[PDB]
Design a protein around this ligand. Structure first.
Ligand SMILES: [Cl-]
Ligand SMILES: [Zn+2]
Ligand SMILES: [Zn+2]
Ligand SMILES: [Zn+2]
Length: 120
DNA sequence: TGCTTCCTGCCAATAACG
DNA sequence: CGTTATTGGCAGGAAGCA
């Protein structure tokens, strides 16, 4: 159908037929495969752009609304995504957000309707 | 070479099923 | 509506880009 399997050292991999990318998760292969098939379409609700993954569309739509969900706990500045937040904390505070301390807060998404993670 | 978007393991939230 | 399947949000490194 849309994949074959490699089994190496007991570990199972799922291989896309088209580009031969390997996936540990079958769910990942399927998510990825839409890029080839365009079976599903994820159109920005604010403009003409269309995405092959739902999450790509959501991250894009956040740019339309201007919501700043990522907040630096050291100085309070907020950022639209992880990358700007991380870049700020490393350059300005000389600390790594992926270290063993919580240096930022991810606020819930309020400018769009997306599913809510209870831990935020 | 510093923004910008992509990528995929993981799994909570949601949907589908029966 | 309780059990199973699916969706897609998240991190944070990778890749794209000018
Ligand atoms: Cl905001
Ligand atoms: Zn592929
Ligand atoms: Zn748009
Ligand atoms: Zn700060």
């Amino acid at each position: 159908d849309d994949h074959y399997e490699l089994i190496v050292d007991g570990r199972v991999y799922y291989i896309c037929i088209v580009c031969k990318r390997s996936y540990v998760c079958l769910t990942s292969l399927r998510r990825h495969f839409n890029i080839h098939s365009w079976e599903k379409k994820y159109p920005c609700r604010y403009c003409e752009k269309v995405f092959p993954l739902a999450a790509y569309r959501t991250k894009h739509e956040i740019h339309h609304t201007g919501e700043r969900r990522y907040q630096c706990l050291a100085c309070g500045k907020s950022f639209i995504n992880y990358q700007f937040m991380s870049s700020h904390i490393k350059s300005v505070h000389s600390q790594d957000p992926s270290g063993d301390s919580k240096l930022y807060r991810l606020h819930p998404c309020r400018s769009l309707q997306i599913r809510q993670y209870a831990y935020l």
